[PDB]
PDB file of C-alpha atoms and ligand atoms in Angstrom:
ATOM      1  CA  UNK A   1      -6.425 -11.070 -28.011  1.00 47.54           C
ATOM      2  CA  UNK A   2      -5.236 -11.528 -24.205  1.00 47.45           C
ATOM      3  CA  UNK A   3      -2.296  -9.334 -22.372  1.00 50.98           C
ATOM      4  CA  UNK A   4      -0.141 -12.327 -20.649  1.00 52.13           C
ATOM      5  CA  UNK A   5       1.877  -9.161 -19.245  1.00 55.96           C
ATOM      6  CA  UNK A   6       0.109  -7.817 -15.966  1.00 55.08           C
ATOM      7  CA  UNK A   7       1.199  -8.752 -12.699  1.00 57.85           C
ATOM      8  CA  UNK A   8      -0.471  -8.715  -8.992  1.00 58.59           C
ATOM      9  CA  UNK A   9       0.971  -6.044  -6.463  1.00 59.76           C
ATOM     10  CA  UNK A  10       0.769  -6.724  -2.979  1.00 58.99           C
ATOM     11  CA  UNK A  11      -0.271  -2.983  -1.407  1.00 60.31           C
ATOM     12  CA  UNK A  12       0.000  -1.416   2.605  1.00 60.37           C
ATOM     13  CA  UNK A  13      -1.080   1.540   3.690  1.00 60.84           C
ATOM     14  CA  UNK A  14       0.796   1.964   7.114  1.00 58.63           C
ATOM     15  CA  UNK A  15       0.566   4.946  10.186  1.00 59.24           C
ATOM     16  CA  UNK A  16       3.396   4.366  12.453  1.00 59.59           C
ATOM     17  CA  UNK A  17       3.249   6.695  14.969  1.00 59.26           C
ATOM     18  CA  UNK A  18       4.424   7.093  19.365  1.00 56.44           C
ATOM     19  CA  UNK A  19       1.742   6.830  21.680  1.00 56.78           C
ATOM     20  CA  UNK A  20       2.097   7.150  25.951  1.00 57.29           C
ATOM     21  CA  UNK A  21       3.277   4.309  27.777  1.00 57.95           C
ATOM     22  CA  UNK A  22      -0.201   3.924  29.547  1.00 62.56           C
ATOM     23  CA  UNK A  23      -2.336   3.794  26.279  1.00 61.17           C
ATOM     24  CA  UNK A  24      -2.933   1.023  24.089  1.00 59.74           C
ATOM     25  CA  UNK A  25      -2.504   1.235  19.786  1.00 60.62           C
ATOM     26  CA  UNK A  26      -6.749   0.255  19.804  1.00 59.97           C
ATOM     27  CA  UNK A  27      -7.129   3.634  21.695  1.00 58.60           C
ATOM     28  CA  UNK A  28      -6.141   5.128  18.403  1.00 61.07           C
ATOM     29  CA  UNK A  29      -6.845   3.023  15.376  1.00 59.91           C
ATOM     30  CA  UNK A  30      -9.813   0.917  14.532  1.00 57.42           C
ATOM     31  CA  UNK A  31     -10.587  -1.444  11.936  1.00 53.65           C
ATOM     32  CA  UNK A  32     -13.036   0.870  10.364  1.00 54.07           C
ATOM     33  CA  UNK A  33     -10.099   3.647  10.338  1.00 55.18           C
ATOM     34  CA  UNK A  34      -8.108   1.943   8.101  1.00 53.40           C
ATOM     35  CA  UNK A  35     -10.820   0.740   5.959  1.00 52.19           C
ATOM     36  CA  UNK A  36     -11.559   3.929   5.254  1.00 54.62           C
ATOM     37  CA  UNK A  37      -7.871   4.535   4.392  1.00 56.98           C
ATOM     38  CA  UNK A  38      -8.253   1.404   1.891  1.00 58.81           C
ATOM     39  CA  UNK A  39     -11.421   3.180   0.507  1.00 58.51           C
ATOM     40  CA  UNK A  40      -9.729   6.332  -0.455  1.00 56.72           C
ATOM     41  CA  UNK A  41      -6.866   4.389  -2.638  1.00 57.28           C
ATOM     42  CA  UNK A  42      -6.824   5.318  -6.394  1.00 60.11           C
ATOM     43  CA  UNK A  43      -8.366   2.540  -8.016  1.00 60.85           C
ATOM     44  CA  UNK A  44      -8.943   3.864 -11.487  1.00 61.11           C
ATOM     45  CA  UNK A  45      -4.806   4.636 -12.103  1.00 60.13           C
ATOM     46  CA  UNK A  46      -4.180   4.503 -15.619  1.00 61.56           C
ATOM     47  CA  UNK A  47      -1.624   1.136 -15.157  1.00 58.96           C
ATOM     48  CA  UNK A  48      -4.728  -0.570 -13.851  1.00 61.02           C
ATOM     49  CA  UNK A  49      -6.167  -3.613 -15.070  1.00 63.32           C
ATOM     50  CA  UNK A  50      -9.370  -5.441 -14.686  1.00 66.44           C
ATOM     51  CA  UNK A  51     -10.790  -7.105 -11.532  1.00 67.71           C
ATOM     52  CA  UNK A  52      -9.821  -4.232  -8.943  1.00 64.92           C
ATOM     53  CA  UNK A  53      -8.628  -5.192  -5.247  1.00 63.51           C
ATOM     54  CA  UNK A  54      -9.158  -7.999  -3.308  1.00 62.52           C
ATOM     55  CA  UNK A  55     -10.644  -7.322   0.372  1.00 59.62           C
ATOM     56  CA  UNK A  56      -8.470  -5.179   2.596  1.00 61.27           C
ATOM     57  CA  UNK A  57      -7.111  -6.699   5.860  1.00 63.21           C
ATOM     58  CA  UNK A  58      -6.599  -3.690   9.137  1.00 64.93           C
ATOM     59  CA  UNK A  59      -3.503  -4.854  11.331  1.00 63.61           C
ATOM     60  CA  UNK A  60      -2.261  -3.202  14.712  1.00 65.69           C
ATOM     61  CA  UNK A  61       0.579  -3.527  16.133  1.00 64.24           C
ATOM     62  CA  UNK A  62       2.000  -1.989  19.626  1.00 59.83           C
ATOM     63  CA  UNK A  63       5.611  -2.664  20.870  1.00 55.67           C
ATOM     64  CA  UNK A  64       7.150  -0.749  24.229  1.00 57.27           C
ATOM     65  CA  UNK A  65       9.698   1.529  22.422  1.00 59.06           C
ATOM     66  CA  UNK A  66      12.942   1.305  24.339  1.00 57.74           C
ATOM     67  CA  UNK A  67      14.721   4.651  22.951  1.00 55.11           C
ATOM     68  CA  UNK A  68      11.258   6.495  23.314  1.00 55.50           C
ATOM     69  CA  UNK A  69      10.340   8.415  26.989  1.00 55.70           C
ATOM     70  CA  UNK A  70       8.099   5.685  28.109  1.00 57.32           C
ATOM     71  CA  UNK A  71       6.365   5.836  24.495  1.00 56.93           C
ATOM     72  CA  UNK A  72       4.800   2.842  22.679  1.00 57.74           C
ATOM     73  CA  UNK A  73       5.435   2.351  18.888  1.00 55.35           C
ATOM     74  CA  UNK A  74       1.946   1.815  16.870  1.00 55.05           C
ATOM     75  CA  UNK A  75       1.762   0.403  13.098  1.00 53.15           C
ATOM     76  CA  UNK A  76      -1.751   0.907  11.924  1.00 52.99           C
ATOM     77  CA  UNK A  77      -1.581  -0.604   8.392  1.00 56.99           C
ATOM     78  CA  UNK A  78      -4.166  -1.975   5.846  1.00 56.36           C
ATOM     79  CA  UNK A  79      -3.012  -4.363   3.276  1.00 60.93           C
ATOM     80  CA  UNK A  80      -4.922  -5.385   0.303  1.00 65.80           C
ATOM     81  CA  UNK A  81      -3.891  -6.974  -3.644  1.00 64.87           C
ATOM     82  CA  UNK A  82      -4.088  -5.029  -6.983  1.00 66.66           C
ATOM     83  CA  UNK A  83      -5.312  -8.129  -9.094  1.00 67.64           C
ATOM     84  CA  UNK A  84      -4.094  -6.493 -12.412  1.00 68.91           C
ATOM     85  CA  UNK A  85      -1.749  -3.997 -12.813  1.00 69.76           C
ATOM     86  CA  UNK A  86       0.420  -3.560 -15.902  1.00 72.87           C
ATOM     87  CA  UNK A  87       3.899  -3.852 -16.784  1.00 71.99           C
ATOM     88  CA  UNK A  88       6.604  -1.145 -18.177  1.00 70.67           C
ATOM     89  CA  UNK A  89       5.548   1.950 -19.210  1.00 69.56           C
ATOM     90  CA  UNK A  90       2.020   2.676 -20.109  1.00 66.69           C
ATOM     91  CA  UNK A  91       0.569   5.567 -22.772  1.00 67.50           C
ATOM     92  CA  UNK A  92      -3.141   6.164 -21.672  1.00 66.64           C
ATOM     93  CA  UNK A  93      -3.437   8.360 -25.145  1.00 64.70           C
ATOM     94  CA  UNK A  94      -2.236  11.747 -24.011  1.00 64.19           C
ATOM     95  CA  UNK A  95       0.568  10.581 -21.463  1.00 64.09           C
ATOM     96  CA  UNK A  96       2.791   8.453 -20.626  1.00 63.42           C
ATOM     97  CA  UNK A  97       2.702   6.154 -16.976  1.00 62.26           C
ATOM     98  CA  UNK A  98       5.418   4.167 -15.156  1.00 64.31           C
ATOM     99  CA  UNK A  99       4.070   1.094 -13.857  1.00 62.58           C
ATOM    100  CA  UNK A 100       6.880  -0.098 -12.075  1.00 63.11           C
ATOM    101  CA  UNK A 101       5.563  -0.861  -8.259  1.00 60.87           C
ATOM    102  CA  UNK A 102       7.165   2.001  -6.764  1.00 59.42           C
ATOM    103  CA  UNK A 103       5.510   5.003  -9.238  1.00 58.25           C
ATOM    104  CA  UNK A 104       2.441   2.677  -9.259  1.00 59.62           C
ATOM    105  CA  UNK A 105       1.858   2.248  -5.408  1.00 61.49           C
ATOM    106  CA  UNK A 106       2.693   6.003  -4.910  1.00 61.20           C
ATOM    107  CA  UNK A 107       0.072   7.522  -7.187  1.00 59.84           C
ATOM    108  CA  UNK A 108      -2.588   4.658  -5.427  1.00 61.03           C
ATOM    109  CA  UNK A 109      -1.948   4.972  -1.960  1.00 61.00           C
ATOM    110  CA  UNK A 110      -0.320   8.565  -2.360  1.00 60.32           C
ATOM    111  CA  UNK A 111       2.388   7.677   0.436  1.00 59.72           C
ATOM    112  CA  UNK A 112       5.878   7.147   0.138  1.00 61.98           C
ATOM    113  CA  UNK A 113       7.063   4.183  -0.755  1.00 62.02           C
ATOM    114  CA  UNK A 114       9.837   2.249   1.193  1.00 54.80           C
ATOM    115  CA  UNK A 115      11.293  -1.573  -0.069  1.00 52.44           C
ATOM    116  CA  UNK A 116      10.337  -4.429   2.154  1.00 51.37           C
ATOM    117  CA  UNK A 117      14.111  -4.740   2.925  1.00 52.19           C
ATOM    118  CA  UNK A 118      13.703  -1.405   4.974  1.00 50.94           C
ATOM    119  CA  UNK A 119      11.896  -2.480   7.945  1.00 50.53           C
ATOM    120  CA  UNK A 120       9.506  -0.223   9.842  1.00 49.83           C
ATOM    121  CA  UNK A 121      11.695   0.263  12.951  1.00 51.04           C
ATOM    122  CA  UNK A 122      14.088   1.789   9.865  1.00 52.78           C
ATOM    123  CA  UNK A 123      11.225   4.266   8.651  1.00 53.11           C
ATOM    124  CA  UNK A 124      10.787   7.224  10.534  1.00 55.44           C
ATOM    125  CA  UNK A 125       8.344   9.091   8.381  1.00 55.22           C
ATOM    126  CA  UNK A 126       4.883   8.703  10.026  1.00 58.26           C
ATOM    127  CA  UNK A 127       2.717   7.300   6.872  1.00 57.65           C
ATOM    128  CA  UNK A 128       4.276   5.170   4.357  1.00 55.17           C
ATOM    129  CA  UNK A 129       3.144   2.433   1.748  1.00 55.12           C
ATOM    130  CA  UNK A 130       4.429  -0.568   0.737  1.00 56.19           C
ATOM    131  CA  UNK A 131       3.835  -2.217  -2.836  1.00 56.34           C
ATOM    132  CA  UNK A 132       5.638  -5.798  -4.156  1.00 54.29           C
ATOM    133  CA  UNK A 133       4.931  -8.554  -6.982  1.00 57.35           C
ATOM    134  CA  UNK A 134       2.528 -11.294  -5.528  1.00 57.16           C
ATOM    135  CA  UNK A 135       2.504 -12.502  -8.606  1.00 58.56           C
ATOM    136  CA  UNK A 136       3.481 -12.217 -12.635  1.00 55.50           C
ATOM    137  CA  UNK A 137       2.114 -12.992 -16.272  1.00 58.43           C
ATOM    138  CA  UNK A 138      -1.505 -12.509 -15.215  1.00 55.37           C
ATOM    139  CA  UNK A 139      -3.816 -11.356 -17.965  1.00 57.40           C
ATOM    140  CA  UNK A 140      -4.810  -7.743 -17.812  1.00 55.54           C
ATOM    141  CA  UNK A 141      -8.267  -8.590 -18.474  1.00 55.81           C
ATOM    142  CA  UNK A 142     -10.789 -10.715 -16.503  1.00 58.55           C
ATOM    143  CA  UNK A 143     -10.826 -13.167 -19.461  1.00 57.84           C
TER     144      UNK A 143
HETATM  145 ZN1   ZN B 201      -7.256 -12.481 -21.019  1.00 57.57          ZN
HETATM  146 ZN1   ZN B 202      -6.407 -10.393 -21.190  1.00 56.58          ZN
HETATM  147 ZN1   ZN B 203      -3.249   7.027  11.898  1.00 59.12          ZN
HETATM  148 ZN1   ZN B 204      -3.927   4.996  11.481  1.00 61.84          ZN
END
């Protein structure tokens, strides 16, 4: 048989954190930092399918903050796509899973998760994940 019923999350990993005015976000975050933080994702969580994750993509991001004391906001994320992931609920044999994105990008990134309608200027917890559909009715195999 096939499973038509997987679908393709769309995973961050994000830092935000205040620097000084004088510094720069690269003073503090490097491409190879947040690789690492893409390395240390789950990627054997019972709702996942075949195929694994594509390449990871670091971002920075710096903005003056204008409520801070002279502070600069940083967002040091890494972004990368679960291929496969199930739908529902999900019995692995002895338990049962909830495969719904929030649960799902939780237990893989093991940050909170916050809805894409929250932006990050809204989030005020330092480290944080993101996790939406990129895409639906993929087969949960690699066949
Ligand atoms: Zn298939
Ligand atoms: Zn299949
Ligand atoms: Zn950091
Ligand atoms: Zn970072």
């Amino acid at each position: 048989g096939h499973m038509l019923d997987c679908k393709a999350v769309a995973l961050k990993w994000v830092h935000q954190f205040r620097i000084p005015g004088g510094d720069n976000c690269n003073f503090y975050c490097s491409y190879d930092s947040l690789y690492q933080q893409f390395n240390l994702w789950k990627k054997n969580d019972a709702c996942q399918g075949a195929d694994g994750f594509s390449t990871a993509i670091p971002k920075i991001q710096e903005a003056p903050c204008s409520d801070c004391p002279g502070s600069k906001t940083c967002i040091c994320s890494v972004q990368a796509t679960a291929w496969r992931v199930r739908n529902g609920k999900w019995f692995d044999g002895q338990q049962w899973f909830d495969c719904d994105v929030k649960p799902y990008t939780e237990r893989v990134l093991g940050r909170r998760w916050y809805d894409e309608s929250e932006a990050d200027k809204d989030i005020y917890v330092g480290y944080y994940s993101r996790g939406f559909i990129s895409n639906d009715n993929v087969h949960c195999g690699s066949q």
